[PDB]
């Protein structure tokens, strides 16, 4: 998902890939910290956009201090 | 007294979970007053900058 997000210069396809990354990382909590740092460091508008929602889905349905500060 | 504990014997140092209750509840009630007043202080200033 990540590789072909960087790869395609079409803007629609990057956004779909960036959001679709999030979905896999539902319920991971702690093991989604590798992904989240990569998405947000990129200077692409679409990558960061889905990058927030990696953080939404990992800790979804219970609170978490680390997640609230980062966002 | 002056050789035995024989004052404030109804709480504090009775079982270890007893002084755990006391120390913490007094800390929490002081803390929530501090955190609300600071957050209000600091928001009055950020509204001034926004303004």
């Amino acid at each position: 998902m990540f590789t072909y997000s960087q790869e395609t210069q079409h803007g629609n396809i990057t956004r779909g890939l960036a959001v679709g990354l999030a979905l896999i990382n539902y319920g991971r909590q702690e093991l989604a910290d590798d992904l989240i740092t990569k998405m947000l460091a990129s200077d692409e508008s679409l990558l960061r956009y889905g990058g927030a929602f990696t953080i939404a889905l990992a800790y979804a349905g219970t609170g978490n201090n680390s997640a609230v500060k980062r966002l | 007294a002056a050789v035995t504990s024989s004052n404030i014997v109804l709480e504090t140092h009775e079982s270890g979970i007893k002084p755990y209750f006391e120390q913490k509840i007094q800390e929490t009630e002081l803390k929530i007053r501090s955190k609300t007043e600071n957050v209000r202080r600091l928001e009055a200033q950020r509204n001034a900058l926004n303004d």
């Binding site: - | 007043e37 600071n38 209000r40 202080r41 009055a44 200033q45």
Partner: protein
């Protein structure tokens, strides 16, 4: 310039007795007001302040005259020997009271200068005290905006 002297009448006499460098005046008052000193926990300090009659006796004379012989100070404070002078002053300057130096090869005491400290790093220490206290007042007021507002809200209607 204190707005009463109506129980401070013994300690006005004490300022005077130390001040001239006179020992007899110190004896007469301490016996006289013995019950009062005993009550106020100031009698213990007056065993040391017997000692400081002469030590502060020096302090006016070395201040007045920058350079004054060992022998001249024997005149003034009626001291045993020239050597007796040197001992009293030497203690006081370790305690820092005089701020002076005794010269034994030219037979006089030379009161040391303070100079100009405006060209030294001393005013930077004074400011540091002032700066730190003022920063603390700006932070404190902002907290105390909030506090009356809580008190009033809790309070029953007016």
């Amino acid at each position: 310039q204190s707005n009463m002297q109506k129980s401070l009448l013994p300690y006005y006499h004490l300022t005077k007795a130390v001040k001239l460098g006179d020992l007899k005046k110190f004896t007469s008052t301490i016996t006289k007001y013995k019950q009062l000193l005993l009550k106020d926990d100031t009698y213990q300090l007056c065993v040391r302040l017997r000692s400081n009659v002469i030590k502060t006796g020096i302090r006016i004379i070395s201040l007045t005259y920058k350079k004054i012989s060992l022998r001249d100070i024997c005149l003034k404070l009626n001291l045993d020997s020239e050597q007796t002078v040197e001992y009293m002053v030497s203690r006081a300057i370790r305690d820092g009271v005089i701020e002076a130096k005794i010269n034994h090869e030219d037979g006089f005491i030379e009161t040391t200068e303070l100079l100009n400290i405006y060209d030294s790093e001393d005013p930077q220490q004074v400011f540091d005290e002032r700066i730190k206290f003022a920063n603390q007042l700006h932070d404190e007021y902002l907290v105390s905006m909030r506090y009356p507002e809580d008190k009033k809200t809790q309070q029953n209607e007016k």
